[PDB]
Amino acid sequence: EDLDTDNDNIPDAYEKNGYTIKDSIAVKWNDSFAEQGYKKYVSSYLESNTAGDPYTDYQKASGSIDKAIKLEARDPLVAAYPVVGVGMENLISRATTNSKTDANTVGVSISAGYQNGFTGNITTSYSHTTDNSTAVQDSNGESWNTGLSINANVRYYNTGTAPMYKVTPTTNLVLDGETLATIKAQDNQIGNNLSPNETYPKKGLSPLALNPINYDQLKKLDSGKQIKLETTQVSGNYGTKNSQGQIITEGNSWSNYISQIDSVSASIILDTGSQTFERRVAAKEQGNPEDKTPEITIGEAIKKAFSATKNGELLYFNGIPIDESCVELIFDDNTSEIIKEQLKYLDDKKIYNVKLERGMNILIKVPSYFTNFDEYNNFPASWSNIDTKNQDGLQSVANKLSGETKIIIPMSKLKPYKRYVFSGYSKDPSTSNSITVNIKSKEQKTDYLVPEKDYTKFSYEFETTGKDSSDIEITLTSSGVIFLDNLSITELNSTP
């Protein structure tokens, strides 16, 4: 075991089967290393840069890279890749917020039930975190025509795993479908450095200010739509070591690698609700028989990309459960088609057990409130008539629904002018009971549900209107006995 075909100081056999770096030397992987904290790395023995990034497999695995790079990008399959966008703080004035997911979720259709095996949803307008949508937070029904009777505050963000140096973004002013001009940061709106999961200017500093609109767009802006600001391209550099040991970011353009990484990877986005992450994971092309990129499943990709913890069987991200049945998976058309085609040949019927291919797009939307009756409950109020003396749950226990259960959801906790979906898993062994669900919202809707012998997922939509309004009431009425588990509420796009 001494061959090095790609010449990156890792033997072919070790890199094919499994290796780890100890004392700056690659060693064969042994299962006893897991408790000591070492991780099992695998990469391609024919290419020195498996993920397509500036750093080779040895440099990533051994940590011999910039120390500002996230520890997730030390896996050869996870690329070091900045994701820089621009978000609007104020416009001129009234305070506004921004969302990196609304454009992705605006085009998802929610149905009452889900088909066999497949659990996630399908979007028609999949977008990345660089697309940003503005939402006015200081609106009280007034229009923008008042006052005038007829600059801009921005703050760059990084959702990638690598820092970008000398950031020069280019953004388009989208007048709800119209473009004034393309604007490029000339000399004073350049960020010298922008670490992952941080903004420029840093938190605690005033939003950046950079140096007109017609009544037709004012009428559009006043009625139901808000301006959006998205980046067409960003130019920046990366750091590498000299022969004298210095770090240089000059001539090291990130644009030399944008196209290569994007074409050998699969895009995955995780949205915790407060902070958002976007990762690229390398995959192999199907036709080529000389492509030696390791093949891993979707759950392994999630664990490697987001450094989730495998506490038993379910993955946990900083304590938040991100398991297949605890989140809302959103794919585009092609990825959903591939997953559905691959699921019929798999007896497990799990999305996370499906092999990861290049070109797939996955979005994970973590619920705002989720309960599983085992260890996790973050609902603002406790559900009524909770039964836990059962051992027939989806994972550990379930809820023995016999009668009526209600939940009190204050309007203050939920963001106004937003679209939500209520989801959960239900099972009825007798297959002779009916479920009636009523949601109290701006519009009251009544829907009937027929559970099956095994666990199935249901979903119902509702919207919240107005900061000052009535509470939200959800009730579950059962004719007989119904098994309930893994109830959750996720936040979809905003509404006019």
Q: Is 32 exposed, middle or buried, given 0-12, 13-18 or 19+ CB atoms closer than 10 A?
A: exposed
Given its own copies, Ca ion, none, residue 14, with its beta carbon under 5 to 8 Å by kind, binds: none
Running DSSP on this structure, what letter comes out for residue 469?
-
Per DSSP, the three-state class of 168 is: strand
Does 452 appear as a known binding residue? no
Q: Verify binding: residue 237, Ca ion, rule CB under 5 A.
A: no
Q: Which of 10, 42, 86, 183 binds its own copies (CB under 8 A)?
A: 183
- Hunting for tokens 């820092």 — which residue is that? 163
For residues 4 and 291, which CB has a smaller minimum distance to Ca ion in the complex?
4
Hey, which residues between 71 and 130 contact its own copies (CB under 8 A)? 71, 90, 92-93, 103, 125, 127
Three-class secondary structure assignment of 359-373: CCEEEEECCCEEECC
Q: How far is the CB of 373 from its own copies (least distance, A)?
A: 29
Tell me the C-alpha distance between 287 and 232, whole Å: 32
Three-class secondary structure assignment of 356-419: CCCCCEEEEECCCEEECCCCCECCCCCCCCCCCCCCCCCCCCCEEECCEEEEEECCCCCCCCEE
Q: Verify binding: residue 43, Ca ion, rule CB under 5 A.
A: yes
Q: In one letter, which amino acid is 207? A: P
Q: Mention every residue, 6+ apart, whose C-beta is less than 8 A from residue 241.
A: 247, 248
Binding range to its own copies, per CB under 8 A, among 113-121, 196-204, 268-276, 410-418: 196-204
For residues 71 and 381, which CB has a smaller minimum distance to its own copies in the complex?
71
Q: Which of 321, 393, 424, 451 binds Ca ion (CB under 5 A)?
A: 393
Does 357 appear as a known binding residue? no
Given its own copies, Ca ion, none, residue 224, with its beta carbon under 5 to 8 Å by kind, binds: none
Given its own copies, Ca ion, none, residue 374, with its beta carbon under 5 to 8 Å by kind, binds: Ca ion
Hey, which residues between 19 and 48 contact its own copies (CB under 8 A)? 21-24, 36-38, 46, 48
Q: Verify binding: residue 381, its own copies, rule CB under 8 A.
A: no
Hey, which residues between 248 and 287 contact its own copies (CB under 8 A)? 248-253, 255-260, 262-264, 285, 287
Nearest CA to 92 out of 241, 209, 242, 239 is that of 209
Given Ca ion, its own copies, none, residue 319, with its beta carbon under 5 to 8 Å by kind, binds: none
Q: Which of 147, 204, 312, 496 binds its own copies (CB under 8 A)?
A: 204
Does 15 appear as a known binding residue? yes
Q: Find out whether 460 and 437 touch, Cβ atoms under 8 Å.
A: yes
Q: Mention every residue, 6+ apart, whose C-beta is less than 8 A from residue 392.
A: 398, 483
CB closest to Ca ion, residue no = 393
Given its own copies, Ca ion, none, residue 125, with its beta carbon under 5 to 8 Å by kind, binds: its own copies
For residues 93 and 432, which CB has a smaller minimum distance to its own copies in the complex?
93
Centre a 10 Å sphere on the Cβ of residue 480 and count the other Cβ atoms it contains. 12
Hey, which residues between 45 and 64 contact Ca ion (CB under 5 A)? 45, 48, 57
For residues 149 and 244, which CB has a smaller minimum distance to its own copies in the complex?
244
For residues 240 and 342, which CB has a smaller minimum distance to its own copies in the complex?
240
Inter-CA distances, 480 with 388, 424, 435, 436, 455, Å? 17, 18, 9, 12, 17
Looking at beta carbons, which pairs linking 237-243 to residues 24 or more positions away fall under 8 Å?
A: 237/164, 237/165, 237/166, 238/54, 238/66, 238/162, 238/163, 238/164, 238/165, 239/66, 239/68, 239/163, 239/165, 240/54
For residues 311 and 465, which CB has a smaller minimum distance to Ca ion in the complex?
311
Q: Mention every residue, 6+ apart, whose C-beta is less than 8 A from residue 178.
A: 217
Instruction: Using CB under 5 A, list all residues that contact Ca ion.
Output: 4, 6, 8, 10, 15, 43, 45, 48, 57, 372-374, 393, 395, 485
Q: Binding-site residues for Ca(2+), please?
A: 4, 6, 8, 10, 12, 15, 44, 47, 57, 372, 374, 395-397, 485
